[PDB]
Amino acid sequence: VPTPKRPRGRPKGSKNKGAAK
DNA sequence: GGGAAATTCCTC
DNA sequence: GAGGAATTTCCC
């Protein structure tokens, strides 16, 4: 695992940045 | 227990 | 090279 591959997902503590239409 | 939103990895 | 699809987390 030489390439830090992060799993698809939403970081913890990530709130909505605005009005998601 | 279900729904909605944001981020990231893979294909052509 | 640029774009699309898949997976995870939080709140009621």
Swiss-Prot record:
It is found in: Nucleus; Chromosome. The gene is HMGA1. Disulfide bonds: none annotated. HMG-I/Y bind preferentially to the minor groove of A+T rich regions in double-stranded DNA. It is suggested that these proteins could function in nucleosome phasing and in the 3'-end processing of mRNA transcripts. They are also involved in the transcription regulation of genes containing, or in close proximity to A+T-rich regions. The modification Asymmetric dimethylarginine is found at residues 8, 10. The modification Phosphothreonine is found at residue 3. Interacts with HIPK2. This is High mobility group protein HMG-I/HMG-Y. Belongs to the HMGA family. Residues 5-21 have a biased composition (Basic residues). The chain holds residues 51 to 71 of 107 of the full protein. The modification Omega-N-methylarginine is found at residues 8, 10.
